[PDB]
Amino acid sequence: MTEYKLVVVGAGGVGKSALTIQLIQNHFVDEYDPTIEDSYRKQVVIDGETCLLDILDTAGGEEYSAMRDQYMRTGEGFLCVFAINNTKSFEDIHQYREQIKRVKDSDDVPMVLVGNKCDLAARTVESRQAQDLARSYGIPYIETSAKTRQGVEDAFYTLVREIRQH
Ligand SMILES: Nc1nc2c(ncn2[C@@H]2O[C@H](COP(=O)(O)OP(=O)(O)O)[C@@H](O)[C@H]2O)c(=O)[nH]1
Numbered sequence: 001m002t003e004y005k006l007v008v009v010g011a012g013g014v015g016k017s018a019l020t021i022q023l024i025q026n027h028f029v030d031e032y033d034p035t036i037e038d039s040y041r042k043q044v045v046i047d048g049e050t051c052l053l054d055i056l057d058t059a060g061g062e063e064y065s066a067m068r069d070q071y072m073r074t075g076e077g078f079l080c081v082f083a084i085n086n087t088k089s090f091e092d093i094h095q096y097r098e099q100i101k102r103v104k105d106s107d108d109v110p111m112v113l114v115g116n117k118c119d120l121a122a123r124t125v126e127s128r129q130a131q132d133l134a135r136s137y138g139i140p141y142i143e144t145s146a147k148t149r150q151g152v153e154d155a156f157y158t159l160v161r162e163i164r165q166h
């Protein structure tokens with residue numbers, strides 16, 4: 001099997017844990033401990049290839065562990081998540097990307113911009129705003145809901161396909 005090492009980054013409360021849990025367990029969590037930072041594994045077939053996903057769900061900000069740094073340094077691709085009803089989290093994306101570029105010493109890192117909570121009414125961040133940001137980075141933009149599952153497979157599987165182009 002090929003293994004793909006994925007790291008999920010973004011502001012607290014955007015749904016990084018909910019997205020990972022949805023992908024792995026097919027269930028939506030209302031209140032997952034916001035400090036739990038751990039890795040999760042899933043065997044999936046993507047485009048006819050059986051592979052293993054090794055996903056680090058990052059927590060808790062302005063902090064670094066041995067595992068975090070390892071996945072950050074050895075992560076092959078990054079989901080950069082914001083919530084479409086959280087303007088600050090969208091504005092924060094720039095910092096996560098700058099961080100990733102520094103760790104990787106590269107502006108060419110497999111990455112997907114994820115606008116999560118698309119089930120919630122009256123977004124404060126427009127799709128076209130996020131499209132314009134992702135275009136400036138040279139990366140895809142995908143909207144998701146950890147609640148309904150909309151886009152969740154699409155985001156993680158696209159990141160896998162980005163890593164494959166690399
Ligand atoms: N309505 C809705 N709520 C979500 C979604 N994703 C996460 N949440 C909620 O947002 C809050 C933060 O989610 P969490 O996964 O802990 O965010 P994290 O800090 O980035 O890991 C929780 O109350 C989740 O139930 C979503 O797609 N839709």
Ligand SMILES: [Mg+2]
Pocket residue numbers: 016017018032033034035036058059
């Ligand atoms: Mg979390």
Ligand SMILES: [Mg+2]
Pocket residue numbers: 124
């Ligand atoms: Mg506005």
